[PDB]
Design a protein around this ligand. Structure first.
Ligand SMILES: NC(=O)c1ccc[n+]([C@@H]2O[C@H](COP(=O)([O-])OP(=O)(O)OC[C@H]3O[C@@H](n4cnc5c(N)ncnc54)[C@H](OP(=O)(O)O)[C@@H]3O)[C@@H](O)[C@H]2O)c1
Ligand SMILES: CCOc1ccc2c(c1)C[C@@H](C(=O)N(Cc1cc(C(=O)O)c(C)o1)Cc1cc(C(=O)O)c(C)o1)CO2
Length: 315
């Protein structure tokens, strides 16, 4: 199934997450994106940050060439990295992502994060103290540049990521706004279910897209190792045993039933294929309330550096 976006385009409600940490060779992104398409994924989530748009694009082209899909069957998302928020940098960044992926357009272009960073070639510009260097940019002007990308046909839809309510409001209340964001891609799972943000987005016809919906990759660079492991949650495990599914499938289906579009990363062929079985079963209303009770305001991504950013969304 798809959801209709507020610009009239459609987005598949299950997306494939493509990030893998730099210790994973890029050949793997090419391989698993092909497997995801083979399994039935049609929404593919990538980004300049991920250093994989070339491989993801090669996988899409290879599946088009063997007649598995057509380009119009694939919903490809890329994201503007935070060193490219200054408005004159936005369209060149998108064109660069398109050249690397060898695509004519993206289905969805997002502002990856509101936390602007010093412009330059470094993804993570850092000073002599090791501190990543922030930049100050009016994100309304970034948004104006995103809108020009949509008008040029390089992005079919535009949206944001990691925005809070106040940041969304800043865009929605912008004078002369042309296009609302179609979505806000945010961390969302049973330990951080974003019910308030979800209700706000629903009222504005903005789709919430959940990342780390399976509890994140627990990268030691971003995730406290003492944080509870989502997929070992005793409630999720009990519902998995009742439904003869897995905890991951319960976590994904939870999002689908509350009107959230859900991403799932896996670089494992069998788990990739497993995740598409989220469409095969339903949670009861009692099950959904049980999962609603798991919320702990737990954001897996927690960097203290970034907690000092003026646009940090969890302040
Ligand atoms: N906008 C942003 O700032 C942002 C931030 C984070 C993520 N994202 C996007 O969201 C994608 C998903 O989020 P994420 O990377 O944090 O990971 P995730 O989807 O929460 O998955 C976490 C881990 O779950 C495991 N997994 C997948 N299916 C499983 C299954 N059926 N059973 C058991 N374990 C399973 C995967 O390991 P295996 O690979 O070993 O299967 C994966 O490493 C990301 O790849 C990215 O595209 C965006
Ligand atoms: C690893 C590359 O090196 C860098 C270097 C600088 C840098 C980032 C990554 C990412 C930025 C960012 O915004 N994230 C982190 C993120 C997103 C994804 C993805 O898969 O999309 C991954 C792998 O990491 C989201 C976020 C974190 C927090 C927090 O609280 O820490 C909040 C509120 O949002 C910050 O700047």
């Amino acid at each position: 199934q798809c959801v209709k976006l507020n610009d009239g385009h459609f987005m598949p409600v299950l997306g494939f997450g493509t990030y893998a940490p730099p210790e994973v060779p890029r050949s793997k992104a090419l391989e698993v994106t092909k497997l995801a398409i083979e399994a039935g994924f049609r929404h593919i989530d990538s980004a300049h940050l991920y250093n994989n748009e070339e491989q993801v694009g090669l996988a899409i082209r290879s599946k088009i060439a063997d007649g598995s899909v057509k380009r119009e069957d694939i919903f490809y998302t890329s994201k503007l990295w935070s060193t490219f928020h200054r408005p004159e940098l936005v369209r060149p960044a998108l064109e660069n992502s398109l050249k690397k992926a060898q695509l004519d357009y993206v289905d969805l272009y997002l502002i990856h994060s509101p936390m602007s960073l010093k412009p330059g070639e470094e993804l993570s510009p850092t000073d002599e103290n090791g501190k990543v260097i922030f930049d100050i940019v009016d994100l309304c002007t970034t948004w104006e540049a995103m809108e020009k990308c949509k008008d040029a046909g390089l992005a079919k839809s535009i949206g944001v990521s990691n925005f809070n309510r106040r940041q969304l409001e800043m865009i929605l209340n912008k004078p002369g706004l042309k296009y609302k964001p179609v979505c806000n891609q945010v961390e969302c799972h049973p330990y951080f279910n974003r019910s308030k943000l979800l209700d706000f987005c629903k009222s504005k016809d903005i789709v919430l897209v959940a990342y780390s919906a399976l509890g994140s990759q627990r990268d030691k660079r971003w995730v406290d190792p003492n944080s509870p492991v989502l997929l070992e949650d005793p409630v999720l495990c009990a519902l998995a045993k009742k439904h003869k599914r897995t905890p991951a499938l319960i976590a994904l289906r939870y999002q689908l039933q509350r009107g959230v579009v859900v991403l799932a990363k896996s670089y494992n062929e069998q788990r990739i294929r497993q995740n598409v079985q989220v469409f095969e079963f339903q949670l009861t209303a009692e099950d959904m309330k049980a999962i609603d009770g798991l919320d702990r305001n737990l954001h897996y991504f927690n960097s203290d550096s970034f907690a000092s950013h003026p646009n940090y969304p969890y302040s």
